[PDB]
Write a structure and sequence with these properties.
Layout lengths: L3 H9 L12 H8 L10 E5 L3 H5 L5 E3 L8 E3 L4 E8 L10 E8 L1 E7 L2 E9 L1
Antiparallel strand pairs: 1-4, 2-3, 3-6, 4-5, 6-7
Catalytic activity: an [RNA] containing cytidine + H2O = an [RNA]-3'-cytidine-3'-phosphate + a 5'-hydroxy-ribonucleotide-3'-[RNA]; an [RNA] containing uridine + H2O = an [RNA]-3'-uridine-3'-phosphate + a 5'-hydroxy-ribonucleotide-3'-[RNA]
Keywords: Disulfide bond, Endonuclease, Glycation, Glycoprotein, Hydrolase, Lyase, Nuclease, Secreted, Signal
Subunit structure: Interacts with and forms tight 1:1 complexes with RNH1. Dimerization of two such complexes may occur. Interaction with RNH1 inhibits this protein. Monomer.
Length: 124
């Protein structure tokens, strides 16, 4: 298929940009990352930092995941992110998203060898 680390990268990494510049950022990215393919994914966060900086979070502050697992880590510093959330009017296959650019800590679930991010838990 796709490995768990490769899938995290495709759904959440966007280092080519420093921040979302238009309210159209989410509609374009959700589409080009093939996240509106079978349905409209309701919520998705893009991180605008290098892959190495995001991978480094697996060695930062260990916190519990929203599901109760303890393989979640919170970044010591804030990072540039973009939250994409489907609007109330969105309907497959005409997906519409609201873009919210912000700077905040990210929380990720890590695993394997090497121990890398495999799930985006929350931003705070």
């Amino acid at each position: 298929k796709e490995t768990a680390a490769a899938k995290f990268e495709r759904q959440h990494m966007d280092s080519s940009t420093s921040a979302a510049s238009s309210s159209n950022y989410c509609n374009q990215m959700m589409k080009s990352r093939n996240l509106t393919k079978d349905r409209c994914k309701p919520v998705n966060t893009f991180v605008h930092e290098s892959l190495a900086d995001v991978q480094a979070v697996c060695s930062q502050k260990n916190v519990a995941c929203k599901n109760g697992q303890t393989n979640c880590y919170q970044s010591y510093s804030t990072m540039s992110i973009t939250d994409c959330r489907e609007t109330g009017s969105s309907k497959y296959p005409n997906c519409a998203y609201k873009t919210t650019q912000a700077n905040k800590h990210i929380i990720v679930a890590c695993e394997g060898n090497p121990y890398v991010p495999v799930h985006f838990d929350a931003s705070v």
